[PDB]
Amino acid sequence: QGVSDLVGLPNQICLQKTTSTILKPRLISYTLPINTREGVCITDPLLAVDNGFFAYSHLEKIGSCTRGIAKQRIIGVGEVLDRGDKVPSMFMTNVWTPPNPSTIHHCSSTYHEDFYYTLCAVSHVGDPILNSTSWTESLSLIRLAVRPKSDSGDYNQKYIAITKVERGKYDKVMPYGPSGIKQGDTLYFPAVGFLPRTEFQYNDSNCPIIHCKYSKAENCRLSMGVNSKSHYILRSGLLKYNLSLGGDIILQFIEIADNRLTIGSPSKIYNSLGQPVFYQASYSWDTMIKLGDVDTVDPLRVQWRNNSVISRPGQSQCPRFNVCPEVCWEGTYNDAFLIDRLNWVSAGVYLNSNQTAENPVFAVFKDNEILYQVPLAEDDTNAQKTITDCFLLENVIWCISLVEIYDTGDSVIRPKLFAVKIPAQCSESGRGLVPR
Numbered sequence: 001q002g003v004s005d006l007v008g009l010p011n012q013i014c015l016q017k018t019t020s021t022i023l024k025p026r027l028i029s030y031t032l033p034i035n036t037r038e039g040v041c042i043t044d045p046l047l048a049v050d051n052g053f054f055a056y057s058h059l060e061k062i063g064s065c066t067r068g069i070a071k072q073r074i075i076g077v078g079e080v081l082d083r084g085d086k087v088p089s090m091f092m093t094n095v096w097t098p099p100n101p102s103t104i105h106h107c108s109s110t111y112h113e114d115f116y117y118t119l120c121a122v123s124h125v126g127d128p129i130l131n132s133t134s135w136t137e138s139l140s141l142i143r144l145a146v147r148p149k150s151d152s153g154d155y156n157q158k159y160i161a162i163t164k165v166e167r168g169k170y171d172k173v174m175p176y177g178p179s180g181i182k183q184g185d186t187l188y189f190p191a192v193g194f195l196p197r198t199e200f201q202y203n204d205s206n207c208p209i210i211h212c213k214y215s216k217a218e219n220c221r222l223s224m225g226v227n228s229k230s231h232y233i234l235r236s237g238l239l240k241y242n243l244s245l246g247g248d249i250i251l252q253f254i255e256i257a258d259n260r261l262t263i264g265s266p267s268k269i270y271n272s273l274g275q276p277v278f279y280q281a282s283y284s285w286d287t288m289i290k291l292g293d294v295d296t297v298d299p300l301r302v303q304w305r306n307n308s309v310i311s312r313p314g315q316s317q318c319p320r321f322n323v324c325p326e327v328c329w330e331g332t333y334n335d336a337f338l339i340d341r342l343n344w345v346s347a348g349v350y351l352n353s354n355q356t357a358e359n360p361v362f363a364v365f366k367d368n369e370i371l372y373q374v375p376l377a378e379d380d381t382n383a384q385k386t387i388t389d390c391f392l393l394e395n396v397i398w399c400i401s402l403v404e405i406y407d408t409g410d411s412v413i414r415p416k417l418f419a420v421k422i423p424a425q426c427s428e429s430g431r432g433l434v435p436r
């Protein structure tokens, strides 16, 4: 109606620590076909939200989420609407499905002007992250009109295989993360590069092992690949697509700078309150949340927050709150979205457990302080990947969070979509007014 980007001067939000239950998560109303029955897992979820539109993707598998048989991959876009209540809802306007559900891997969506542009890898050897040597570089673009039009040719849906990929020293590159940004007529997608370990230049003396008893200086370089002797190391970055250029589509890989370097992992870049922000999943020993203002997009340098309160579950080598270099490849993607630049306040869903993917908690937090939070499920509810995007509905900050969750009544793993308004008051309605 009035759903737009988080920009300008939003209505006030609570900026102090409180135990009051001011967060009131709601399951959001949607037309996305993301409900099922038992026997199937809905995995590989993607959510993007932009300028009152959204993009969404998943892979439906028969059986296990990791080992099941690929049933259906969908990429869908739509509008974020007002259901009449000044509450957001998601209406899907355009859905694309490939004939082979198993060959599309690692999609990433960026919005521009009429379309969501979704960049995906194409693989016949499974997950390129797990079959790095076998996978031959193959990327495709699925362009979808957010408002389809009849008798428009390829305006509604356009598929294009991309052959010209500028990757510099890397052998191969691919999208890695849910969503990116536009700057003018150029799109940037979160991405990763595969670089042979033999070409990786790293001084082990840069690996911070002070006050870390059990750490060896080699641990940072060894943990830049999926195991200590991996043929490749992984480096996060961006894939640049300039819509203004004529002809044969060219993508260009832009590696992330080496400040607070960790293994290439699903990331996202987004604009909030006038500037790009980056989140990088912590898939190794540096387990505190990695997010910050993007200093420069190309070359890519992120001013990582010194956040001391949000982490992610791992196993015992790199469990939650680990900070010392170890050789490990583990963790979860749980992003956060800047909603107040002056005080650097963010909103996102974290998993409140040290070594188990469970207990999704929606939190509003600063670098060194969680201000307020609310659980999204009963305790010991298993949950893994979370994607949070925030926006304005008539100048009020709302967030939509995708949570990959075990559904009890419908005994399957699937994404659930929560809408959460950020309140203005630090006390909840009626607090202290109901007697005792």
Ligand SMILES: *[C@@H]1O[C@H](COC2O[C@@H](C)[C@@H](O)[C@@H](O)[C@@H]2O)[C@@H](O[C@@H]2O[C@H](CO)[C@@H](O)[C@H](O)[C@H]2NC(C)=O)[C@H](O[C@@H]2O[C@@H](C)[C@@H](O)[C@@H](O)[C@@H]2O)[C@H]1NC(C)=O
Binding pocket: 319, 320, 321, 322, 323, 354
């Ligand atoms: C969840 O993990 C916390 C681990 O903190 C620690 O960091 C990891 C990387 C390992 O090196 C652990 O060996 C290390 O303890 C743990 O909390 C910490 O607890 C220690 C004492 O046990 C305390 O000195 C730290 O300040 C504290 N840190 C934080 C950020 O809380 C959790 O333990 C729970 O919370 C503690 C405060 C204390 O009540 C513990 O008894 C309690 O179990 C741990 N949670 C669980 C449920 O294991």
Ligand SMILES: *[C@@H]1O[C@H](CO)[C@@H](O[C@@H]2O[C@H](CO)[C@@H](O)[C@H](O)[C@H]2NC(C)=O)[C@H](O)[C@H]1NC(C)=O
Binding pocket: 124, 125, 126, 127, 130, 131, 134
């Ligand atoms: C890496 O690629 C190889 C080659 O495609 C995969 O091996 C195939 O695995 C399927 C599934 O079990 C078998 O049906 C084929 O017979 C295998 N082909 C060959 C040539 O061995 C392997 O599974 C892939 N690894 C991962 C982790 O996806």
Ligand SMILES: *[C@@H]1O[C@H](CO)[C@@H](O[C@@H]2O[C@H](CO)[C@@H](O)[C@H](O)[C@H]2NC(C)=O)[C@H](O)[C@H]1NC(C)=O
Binding pocket: 186, 242, 243, 244, 245, 246
């Ligand atoms: C995207 O491509 C356009 C060209 O199509 C770039 O715009 C040009 O920049 C050069 C400077 O090297 C000028 O000489 C041209 O006149 C510009 N053309 C237009 C139409 O503005 C643009 O800079 C590219 N964007 C990015 C981010 O690389």
Ligand SMILES: *[C@@H]1O[C@H](CO)[C@@H](O)[C@H](O)[C@H]1NC(C)=O
Binding pocket: 292, 303, 304, 305, 306
């Ligand atoms: C984080 O701390 C370091 C201190 O070593 C400082 O140089 C850096 O500017 C801090 N980052 C932010 C975003 O404040």
